[PDB]
Amino acid sequence: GSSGSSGSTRRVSVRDKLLVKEVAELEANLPCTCKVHFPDPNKLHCFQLTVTPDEGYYQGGKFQFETEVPDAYNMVPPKVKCLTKIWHPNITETGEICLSLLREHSIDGTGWAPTRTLKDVVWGLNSLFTDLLNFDDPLNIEAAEHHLRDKEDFRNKVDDYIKRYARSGPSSG
Numbered sequence: 001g002s003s004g005s006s007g008s009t010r011r012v013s014v015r016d017k018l019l020v021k022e023v024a025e026l027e028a029n030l031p032c033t034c035k036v037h038f039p040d041p042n043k044l045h046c047f048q049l050t051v052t053p054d055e056g057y058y059q060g061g062k063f064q065f066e067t068e069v070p071d072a073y074n075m076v077p078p079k080v081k082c083l084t085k086i087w088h089p090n091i092t093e094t095g096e097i098c099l100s101l102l103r104e105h106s107i108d109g110t111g112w113a114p115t116r117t118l119k120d121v122v123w124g125l126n127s128l129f130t131d132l133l134n135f136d137d138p139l140n141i142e143a144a145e146h147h148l149r150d151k152e153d154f155r156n157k158v159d160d161y162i163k164r165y166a167r168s169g170p171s172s173g
Helices: 014-029 118-127 141-149 151-165
Strands: 034-037 047-051 063-068 079-082
Touching: 014 034, 014 118, 034 118, 047 118, 063 118, 141 151
Parallel strands: none
Antiparallel strands: 034 047, 047 063, 063 079
């Protein structure tokens, strides 16, 4: 029923089963652009996610993302932070993400819910460099300023920001 105004310390119950079940179908539903890998089974909540878009500016830019699943889950959205450095306006150079679905009770409207899963939360992180790519209220200004002044220089710089601390490997150019 209703629960609040009290400590919440109960060994994982639903989450666990919610992960193993999802995480599984996720590795099967995942597109041919993203790659997930779990270092240790004991801990499912925390895992390593990879996203390498074959289109746009980052046509060949490999990046990693660390997703965290709290106890609330699927009551609450998992905390995801970028590990690699990218000149993306939405994903700061440090490791910050700006996803709506990953917003609690998003006062706006579009936030998280027990309807979606780690499968949908990942699909978006992949579009962050395809469609979602917005240049209005991004996390990093510079990234956006470089696009406003010049759309070419913006994409050109990316190439470097990639090979700098990100490499994919040999591929038909």
